[PDB]
Amino acid sequence: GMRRTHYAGSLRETHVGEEVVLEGWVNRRRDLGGLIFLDLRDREGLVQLVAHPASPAYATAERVRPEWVVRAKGLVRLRPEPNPRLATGRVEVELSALEVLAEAKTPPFPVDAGWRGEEEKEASEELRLKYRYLDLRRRRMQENLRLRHRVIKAIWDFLDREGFVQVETPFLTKSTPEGARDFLVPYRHEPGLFYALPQSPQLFKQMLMVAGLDRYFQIARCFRDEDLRADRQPDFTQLDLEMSFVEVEDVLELNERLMAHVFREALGVELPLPFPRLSYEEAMERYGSDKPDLRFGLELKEVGPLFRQSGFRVFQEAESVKALALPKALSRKEVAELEEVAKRHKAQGLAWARVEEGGFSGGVAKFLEPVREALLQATEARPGDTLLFVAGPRKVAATALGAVRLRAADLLGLKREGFRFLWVVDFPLLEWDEAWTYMHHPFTSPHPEDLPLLEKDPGRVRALAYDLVLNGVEVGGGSIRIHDPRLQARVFRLLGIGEEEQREKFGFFLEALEYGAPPHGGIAWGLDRLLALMTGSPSIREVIAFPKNKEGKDPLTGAPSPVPEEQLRELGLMVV
Amino acid sequence: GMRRTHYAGSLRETHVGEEVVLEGWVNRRRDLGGLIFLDLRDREGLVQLVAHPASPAYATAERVRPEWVVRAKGLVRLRPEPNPRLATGRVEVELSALEVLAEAKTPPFPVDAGWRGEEEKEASEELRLKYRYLDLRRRRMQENLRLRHRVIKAIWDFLDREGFVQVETPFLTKSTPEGARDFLVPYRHEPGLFYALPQSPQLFKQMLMVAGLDRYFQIARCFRDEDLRADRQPDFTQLDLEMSFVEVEDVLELNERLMAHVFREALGVELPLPFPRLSYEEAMERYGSDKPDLRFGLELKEVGPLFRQSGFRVFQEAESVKALALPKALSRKEVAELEEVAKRHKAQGLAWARVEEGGFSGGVAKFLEPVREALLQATEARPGDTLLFVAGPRKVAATALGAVRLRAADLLGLKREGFRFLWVVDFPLLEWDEEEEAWTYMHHPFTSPHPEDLPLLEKDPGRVRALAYDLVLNGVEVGGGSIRIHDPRLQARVFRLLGIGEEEQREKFGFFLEALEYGAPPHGGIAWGLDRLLALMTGSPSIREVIAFPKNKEGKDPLTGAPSPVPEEQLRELGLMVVRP
Numbered sequence A: 001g002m003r004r005t006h007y008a009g010s011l012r013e014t015h016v017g018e019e020v021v022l023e024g025w026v027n028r029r030r031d032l033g034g035l036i037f038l039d040l041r042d043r044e045g046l047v048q049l050v051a052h053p054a055s056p057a058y059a060t061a062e063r064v065r066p067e068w069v070v071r072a073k074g075l076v077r078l079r080p081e082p083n084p085r086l087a088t089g090r091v092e093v094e095l096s097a098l099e100v101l102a103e104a105k106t107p108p109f110p111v112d113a114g115w116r117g118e119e120e121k122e123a124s125e126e127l128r129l130k131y132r133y134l135d136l137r138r139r140r141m142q143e144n145l146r147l148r149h150r151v152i153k154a155i156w157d158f159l160d161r162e163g164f165v166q167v168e169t170p171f172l173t174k175s176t177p178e179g180a181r182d183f184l185v186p187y188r189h190e191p192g193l194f195y196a197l198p199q200s201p202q203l204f205k206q207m208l209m210v211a212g213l214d215r216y217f218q219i220a221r222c223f224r225d226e227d228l229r230a231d232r233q234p235d236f237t238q239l240d241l242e243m244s245f246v247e248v249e250d251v252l253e254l255n256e257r258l259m260a261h262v263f264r265e266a267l268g269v270e271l272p273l274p275f276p277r278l279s280y281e282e283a284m285e286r287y288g289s290d291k292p293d294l295r296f297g298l299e300l301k302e303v304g305p306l307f308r309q310s311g312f313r314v315f316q317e318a319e320s321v322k323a324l325a326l327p328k329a330l331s332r333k334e335v336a337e338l339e340e341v342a343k344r345h346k347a348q349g350l351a352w353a354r355v356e357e358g359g360f361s362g363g364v365a366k367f368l369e370p371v372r373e374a375l376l377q378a379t380e381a382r383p384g385d386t387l388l389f390v391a392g393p394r395k396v397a398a399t400a401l402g403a404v405r406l407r408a409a410d411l412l413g414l415k416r417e418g419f420r421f422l423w424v425v426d427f428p429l430l431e432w433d434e435a436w437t438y439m440h441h442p443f444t445s446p447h448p449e450d451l452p453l454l455e456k457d458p459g460r461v462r463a464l465a466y467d468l469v470l471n472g473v474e475v476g477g478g479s480i481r482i483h484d485p486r487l488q489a490r491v492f493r494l495l496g497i498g499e500e501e502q503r504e505k506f507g508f509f510l511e512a513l514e515y516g517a518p519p520h521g522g523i524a525w526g527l528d529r530l531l532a533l534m535t536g537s538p539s540i541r542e543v544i545a546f547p548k549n550k551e552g553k554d555p556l557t558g559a560p561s562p563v564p565e566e567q568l569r570e571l572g573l574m575v576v
Numbered sequence B: 001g002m003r004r005t006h007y008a009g010s011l012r013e014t015h016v017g018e019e020v021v022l023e024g025w026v027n028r029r030r031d032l033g034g035l036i037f038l039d040l041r042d043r044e045g046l047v048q049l050v051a052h053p054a055s056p057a058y059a060t061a062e063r064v065r066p067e068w069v070v071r072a073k074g075l076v077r078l079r080p081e082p083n084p085r086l087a088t089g090r091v092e093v094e095l096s097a098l099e100v101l102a103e104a105k106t107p108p109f110p111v112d113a114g115w116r117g118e119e120e121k122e123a124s125e126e127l128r129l130k131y132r133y134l135d136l137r138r139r140r141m142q143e144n145l146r147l148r149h150r151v152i153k154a155i156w157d158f159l160d161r162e163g164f165v166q167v168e169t170p171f172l173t174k175s176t177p178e179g180a181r182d183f184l185v186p187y188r189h190e191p192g193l194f195y196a197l198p199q200s201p202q203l204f205k206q207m208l209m210v211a212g213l214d215r216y217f218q219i220a221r222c223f224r225d226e227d228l229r230a231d232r233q234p235d236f237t238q239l240d241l242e243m244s245f246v247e248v249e250d251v252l253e254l255n256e257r258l259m260a261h262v263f264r265e266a267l268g269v270e271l272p273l274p275f276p277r278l279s280y281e282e283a284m285e286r287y288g289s290d291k292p293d294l295r296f297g298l299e300l301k302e303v304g305p306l307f308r309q310s311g312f313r314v315f316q317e318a319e320s321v322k323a324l325a326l327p328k329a330l331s332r333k334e335v336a337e338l339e340e341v342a343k344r345h346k347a348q349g350l351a352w353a354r355v356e357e358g359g360f361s362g363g364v365a366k367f368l369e370p371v372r373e374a375l376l377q378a379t380e381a382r383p384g385d386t387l388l389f390v391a392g393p394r395k396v397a398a399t400a401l402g403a404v405r406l407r408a409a410d411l412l413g414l415k416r417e418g419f420r421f422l423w424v425v426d427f428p429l430l431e432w433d434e435e436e437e438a439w440t441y442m443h444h445p446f447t448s449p450h451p452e453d454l455p456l457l458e459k460d461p462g463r464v465r466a467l468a469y470d471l472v473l474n475g476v477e478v479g480g481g482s483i484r485i486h487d488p489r490l491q492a493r494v495f496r497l498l499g500i501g502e503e504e505q506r507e508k509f510g511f512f513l514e515a516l517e518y519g520a521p522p523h524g525g526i527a528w529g530l531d532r533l534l535a536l537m538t539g540s541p542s543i544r545e546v547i548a549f550p551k552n553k554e555g556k557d558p559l560t561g562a563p564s565p566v567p568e569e570q571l572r573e574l575g576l577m578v579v580r581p
Ligand SMILES: Nc1ncnc2c1ncn2[C@@H]1O[C@H](COS(=O)(=O)NC(=O)[C@@H](N)CC(=O)O)[C@@H](O)[C@H]1O
Pocket: A199, A200, A201, A202, A224, A231, A232, A233, A234, A235, A236, A237, A238, A440, A474, A475, A476, A477, A478, A479, A522, A523, A524, A525, A526, A527, A528, A529
């Protein structure tokens, strides 16, 4: 069997009197009063080893250095005084034996402090990625990775109970000139032919519904050669799922219970069900964003129809006027800060006014007095508040003041805590291109109520699509799919997408619909983004074991790197 | 919630009297005396629907064709005569409503037979792949993928219980060597730069032991550009795992318990523990193969010294001869078949001879009668058998006859049953190629030599044992692994022996070698071939039967048309062009 009797960090007072054998890394050494104290570290935490002058281990204990790997043997004793910052804090190990298994160079950054419950100084992320195997020794990184394990196991447990079948889908598949750019893989035996990495399992998982598997899931790797962001890697992980014979309601309710199960089991957090839902239109109107942050209020209010008889032409003639009431008298600097946030979001400007006991003061206060009663009933502003207004096209005014609202939260120091999920539903199927564009993929079903509006009034057609939002971040997205090939053809005909282009991009899938596809729909979570939010991480790199840096490269291995020209000649390709 | 009240295949006589809502595919339609009988299919199986002329459902039922998708409502009744071939066979649904959710044209091959409990005609595999989404409707294919699901879930339950941390490793990286070519990915922003797809997560899981995670696993996708074979796909799946502070035995016992759990939970099969073990030497000495098939006997016997003083120079001069006593009298055409498979395995020839009541019968029975009493004691070949022989070097003799042994099982109709696992252990650090007569290495260069053999690394490399092990099932390699090198000095020492200078060390493994200098713990691990295991668990002829959307035997994808060209514009954006012949 194993030589170690316990994980080092698992020793408690219940083990006093036992002889133990431990293996781990030297976190830190301390010489105090002729005793040698060694913090022994493994993944379950630190335990204090003590070498006494009489002990056979005494000389060895004096020469060991941080990060050396050792095997220790001794007796579990109570500490004279416990250290409550360690779960092993009541006990220590009186060393009888100490053996060196590997020496270690001094690491380029410290990894010992987190294991003592001390704050850790921020290190260069580029240095952390270069020595990622050392960065992953830190307690916070192991907690992230172990939480990610617990989340995926919880997903498996739940979806297996609900009758879902995990199916693994191809990584080498068809290159399509649609969507984001594909990562390509050269096919050695016929130069000029390429596989592509999958942007998502979408077509495969729909084909699994055509195959009658009823319900599917996969922890799926997705590859998109696009520009990067703090929650955006060249390859990332989705929880991908698809069900048959469902309506929007069935997909949402399943995902709510799954998410509640995940948070309960992996974080010990209780999520109230059901999640709140807002139409896309409601979200834009009340928050100015299709991914609202519900951790604070400060909703936007449409006050356009209060100023149709006003002398203030910029309010009076505007298509929309959005108002926001902040519970604090702002600095003129702060107002100008918010004005700049509004202008950066296409707004013509940001009007403002202070609310007093009997009226308004400053900014556009003069033009607000005539409608004071209605303006206060619509905004519910109180004496002391600041009123912020953006006037213009309806979508511009909403989005500008929604960004202003987000910035206002920071400038007011609002405590934003917990996990606030919501569904955004009833997205528009289409959007005009300065033609007609869709959101994500063209297999999203139109609302059956809106079918006649496809050709008569396309911009008003609702899709059966939904986004899952957590604390103002898009953690998931899906839809009910088109399963009638005659309706899919009708959507393509409306999109101007010719039959030759359909067969080139989607021919094998469109043929599949001719053999009886069931009603079906699904979703994919951004699993890295969820875990980042679950851990309060500033970037999804904190929840990926070996990510790329924010520039798409890997400082650890050096990829991407050149290859010998003989390796590239074998593929029949050459650098231009 | 769902309109559906039950899965179609789940209805039983206990449901008689209930009104049900079902959704699924029309497996078959039969018309009889005005009634319309629809076998409704979903993933749980078939149930008969009955549409009566008087029903509101009837007009719709008249339109329905095979593979149409319908929603059905009605009352469960007993059938006047049950169908004992069906789980729902005692009952039927008297339809009150029927709605078509999707029409369907006739499939290019039938999917209905297996749901009825009837044998299925073999269809062209290239056609099944072009329409894989229809092929996956068959009961057999669904059984395979749901078994694949249960195996992975069982793996997660066991290893999570044992404290392993699942960690996902990169696919756009620099690759570890496992014996194949790398699949490359052009880096768009600087032509001439490439990613590699990982042949395995080898170096990442070792770095995870450097990171102190103690024990890791991953259901890992691996990518290898190598020659085609029905047991290998260009991209395939491993159960990959690694452990810290372990010896060989620790890794072997954990894997035995894991495999026993998988078979119990997914197949209801008990596997006796522990698995038998054979050294690499003992495996080939007795079976002429490092992946022995233990489902039958016919072991190889060493008859070397019994020819030191005879006239047959082939048997006297050879480094070894071995014998196999097939309990039957082979035909002259059968011995030619075995000779072909023997000579195909670089054998000098297949010496043969029957055995009668006291003497022999032809072949090399001339040089065989001199030692009829001594050799018969070794082989124990009752009269009526045949005796096959190979003469030559040690490795060539066993391998050639061991290959004949395997063919003999097929030509003799041996009933080989069940699941026979074994560990093959104590592989040499180097394996000698016969053709290229050079020192290859089977397992990757991070495999640790046996610590007692470290002085032989410089004095006598071919005597060095490796701390490696292969898991074998029914003559098939389902897993392989080793204890690794954690000392940076020793790892460089083993690189320089394998023909890798300091320059190549830094370029290919510099980052990993430096990691070893920060306190790497003892570690070791293994990886299963998950597709291979599943193919064996289902009795499938190839791993394509247990992969949802595999490539064909030629490595292409007929469902989607991959691999395919890409526009000239997309190609030049990568700063690459195809070389002209
Ligand atoms: N580069 C990136 N890095 C990290 N996370 C990312 C990401 N790009 C997207 N995500 C995350 O992946 C989620 C799903 O991806 S997706 O929105 O592109 N949709 C779909 O894929 C459909 N097929 C699913 C369906 O329709 O069933 C997003 O909401 C993000 O959280």
